[PDB]
């Protein structure tokens, strides 16, 4: 949703309907810090979410020994060594597709040919 915060007291703003121009105005509840909104979206709720299947990837992901190694193709540097792990989300109806992280360039790629 990309919440915006006030620049005076650091409080996240709320949308307010005005009949002067009929535009989305995000204002601060504390000091009336009124600003324009760069997107008409104010509320979003997903039932099935693909965000978090690649979570936890840092610059030192390949240094951890218990993550298994493969010999797949990394399409950024053509490397023969990479680590792989499934989706870290624990949903009961999630897929079993893997995610592969290269060590040379830290590029992530999935093994979903239905998606590809």
């Amino acid at each position: 949703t990309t919440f915006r915060f006030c620049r005076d007291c650091n409080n996240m703003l709320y949308p307010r309907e005005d009949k002067e121009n009929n535009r989305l105005l995000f204002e601060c509840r504390t000091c009336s810090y009124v600003e324009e909104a760069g997107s008409p979206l104010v509320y979003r709720h997903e039932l099935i979410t693909n965000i978090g299947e690649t979570a936890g990837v840092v610059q030192d992901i390949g240094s951890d020994p218990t993550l298994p190694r493969s010999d797949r193709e990394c399409p950024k540097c053509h490397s023969r060594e990479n680590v792989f792990f499934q989706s870290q989300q624990r949903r009961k109806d999630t897929s079993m597709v893997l995610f592969f992280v290269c060590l040379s360039c830290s590029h992530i790629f999935t093994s979903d040919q239905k998606n590809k």
Binding site: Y14, P15, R16, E17, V42, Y43, H45
Partner: protein
């Protein structure tokens, strides 16, 4: 049904009378309305039924 984007849209109708405080708190009641379509609307079937499978 043949569209690549599966979008259904809804709006609520404003009354002819003036609303001095309803429009300010409209977002919360629209959230409540989304919540009451989330679980309280039955497209088809009867209550107290979870999942049906077929066997031969």
């Amino acid at each position: 049904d043949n569209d690549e984007k599966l979008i259904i849209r809804c709006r609520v109708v404003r009354p002819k009378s003036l609303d001095a405080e309803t429009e300010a708190e409209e977002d919360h009641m629209l959230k409540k309305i989304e919540n009451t379509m989330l679980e309280n609307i039955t497209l088809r079937g009867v209550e107290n039924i979870e999942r049906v499978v077929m066997m031969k």
